[PDB]
Amino acid sequence: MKITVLVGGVGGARFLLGVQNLLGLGSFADGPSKHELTAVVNIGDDAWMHGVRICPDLDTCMYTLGGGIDPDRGWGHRNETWNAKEELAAYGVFGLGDRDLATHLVRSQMLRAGYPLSQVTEALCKRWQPGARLLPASDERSETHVVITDPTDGERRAIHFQEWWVRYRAKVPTHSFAYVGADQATAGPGVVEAIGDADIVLLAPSNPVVSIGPILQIPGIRGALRSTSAPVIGYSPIIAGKPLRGMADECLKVIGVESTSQAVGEFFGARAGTGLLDGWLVHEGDHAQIEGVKVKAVPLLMTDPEATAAMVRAGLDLAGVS
Amino acid sequence: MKITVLVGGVGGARFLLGVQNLLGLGSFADGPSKHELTAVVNIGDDAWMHGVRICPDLDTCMYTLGGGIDPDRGWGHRNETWNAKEELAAYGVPDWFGLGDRDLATHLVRSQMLRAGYPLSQVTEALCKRWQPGARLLPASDERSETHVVITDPTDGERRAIHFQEWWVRYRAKVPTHSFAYVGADQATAGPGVVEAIGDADIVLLAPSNPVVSIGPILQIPGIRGALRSTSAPVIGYSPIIAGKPGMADECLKVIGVESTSQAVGEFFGARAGTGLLDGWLVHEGDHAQIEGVKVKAVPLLMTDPEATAAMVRAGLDLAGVS
Ligand SMILES: [Ca+2]
Ligand SMILES: [Ca+2]
Ligand SMILES: [Ca+2]
C-alpha cells in the first residue's frame, strides 16, 4: 500500500495527481484510503532570491495536489497579482506572485528559526493538505547550476539553472551542469526509508537531467534506489508525434544525449547493470530496447488525472505489483 | 543653503514637503537647486515582521517626497493590494499588521541588503535612487533603537513590554500604559552624517510630529542630543498641539505625565539657554505659551497643503532670523 515517486517540475506534480486519482488519495478521496503516497521532490531549482527561500518543485506539488493552481493558466495561484514583482523591477533588480511571496515569507522564517526544509514543508502542507508526503530530496543545499561561457569576458561561469533558463539558454555556449552542494548533502529525512520500504518506486516523466537527475546527485539516494526490493519503473518524457516532430530537449543537449526514449532509458540504465531501472515505459508508437530492462509502449500523455491514472496502472502491471 | 529637520510620522513627511516647496526642491524643482534639505528620521518604530525589516518613518518620507504615498491613509503605497497579507492569514500566522504587496518589495530589498551587511543609511540611499525624494533621508541611527511600551496585558493582567507597533496598531493605546522605553538608544551611535547635518545647518527644525514617540526617540540617541546642544544653528520647534480641536499624541503625553498643551510640550524639549533644546517655538493661531529662553510666536500651523506648510517653514526661518 506504499508508493514512492521521484518528482520534479510541472510534470512531476501532474503525475502524482494521477497516482492520487488511481488510489483515491487527496482531492480524489471518497472514504479514507488504503494507500499512502510518498514523493521524493527535487530541490535542484531551490534558491535564495530577494532574501527569501524559493522551492519551486516542492511548491508545485503542494499547490497542485492541494487544489491551488489556476486551471486556466496551469501555473500559480488563482486571483494572483504581481504587484510586488512590479515594484521590484522599479527598484531595478520565477514569476514571484504576491500570493506566492507569502509562502516564501513563512518558509524563510521557519528556516531561519532552525526548522529543516522537511519540517517547513509539513508545516505548509497543514494548510494545503496535499494528501501526499512531500519529502525534499535533501534538507541541505543542492542547487543545480549551468556552466556557460560568459560573453562579457569569455570566462566559464556557473549560473543557477533558473537564471540560465530564462536569460542565457540558447544565447551563449553551455558546457555542463554542476550540482552546487550535492557532495556535502545527505538524503533528507525519510527519503532512504521511503525508497527502501516501498512496494514500488516510480520516476515521474519529468526532465531526466534537471528534474529527476538532481535527486540522484544527493548522496545516499542512488544507493537506496539500487538496493531496494521495490521494483523501479521509469516513465519516458519523450512524446513523439508533435507538429514538425517537436524539438530536442535543451537540457539533454547540454550533456549530449539524444531526445529519444532509447537514450533517456540508457541514461538511467538497467539495475541489472549499474543503472536504476527495472522497467521503462514509453509512449504508444515508441520503442526502446535496453539489456536488462522491461520496456512496454502504452499511452503516456498526462491529459487529465484519469489518463495519468491509467499510466500509473500500466507501471504497476509491468512491475507485477498489486 | 542647508536646512536640517527632525522628523517622524505622516506629519514629518508633510512638513518636509513644505520645506521642499519653499526652496524649490524635489517635485517642486524649477531650475537650478540652491538649497539642500536633510531629514533626520525617527527609527524608533522600526521592527522585524515576518522576517523583513519595516522602517515606517523612513518609508513614509521616501514615498511622500517621491509621489508614491497613499493620500487616504497617509502611510503605504497608492493603489496597494493585500493579496500576500491575505495568504499569510490563510496560513494562520502576527496578523494585526498590514504588509501591502507593493510595500513588501521595499521590505524585501531592504531586508536582503541589511542581511548582506549594508548599513541602513546605505539601504536608504539605494532605495531613494528610485524615488528621487529630493532630500537626504538620514536614519537617526544605523543601529537598533526600538521604542517599547510597558503595559498591563488584559489577557492575564501581567506587566508586558510590546513594540510600539503593537501598542498603536493592535491595541490603539487603549490598554493600561505605564512607560516608554528606548531599548538600545544608549548603545546606538548617531547615523552617518546626522551629527554633521545638525552641526553644519543654517537652521534646525523639529517637525510638529509626536513629541514622545516620533521626535523624542531621536533625542534619546546620545550623539544627536549633543549635536543639537552645541550647533551654531538656531533650533526651531513646531508645537503639535492645535488645542481645542482634533491622532493620539495626546495619549503618549499622558503616559509620561505631560499635559497636552503648547506650553507643556515646549517645556518638554526645553530651552537651550537652560538644559533644553529649543531657541524658538511656534504655536497655532489663538494659542499662547512662553518659555524662559525661548522666543514663542503664534502663527498658522496647519499642514493642509504644501503651500500652507511652506509658510510654516518661512515663519520658522523668520523667528530664527535666518534668510
Ligand atoms: Ca500528433
Ligand atoms: Ca552599538
Ligand atoms: Ca535617556
Residue numbers in the entry:
A (entry chain A): 1 to 93, 98 to 326
B (entry chain B): 1 to 93, 95 to 247, 250 to 326
Quote the study that presented this structure, word for word.
In order to resolve the catalytic mechanism of DH-F420-0 synthesis, purified FbiA was crystallized, and its structure was determined at 2.3 Å by X-ray crystallography. FbiA crystallized as a dimer mediated by the interaction of three α-helices and a β-sheet. The structure of CofD from M. mazei, a homologous enzyme that instead utilizes LPPG derived from 2PL as its substrate, also crystallized as a dimer with an analogous interface to FbiA.
In mycobacteria, this cofactor has multiple roles, including adaptation to redox stress, cell wall biosynthesis, and activation of the clinical antitubercular prodrugs pretomanid and delamanid. To determine the structural basis of dehydro-F420-0 production, we solved high-resolution crystal structures of the enzyme responsible (FbiA) in apo-, substrate-, and product-bound forms.
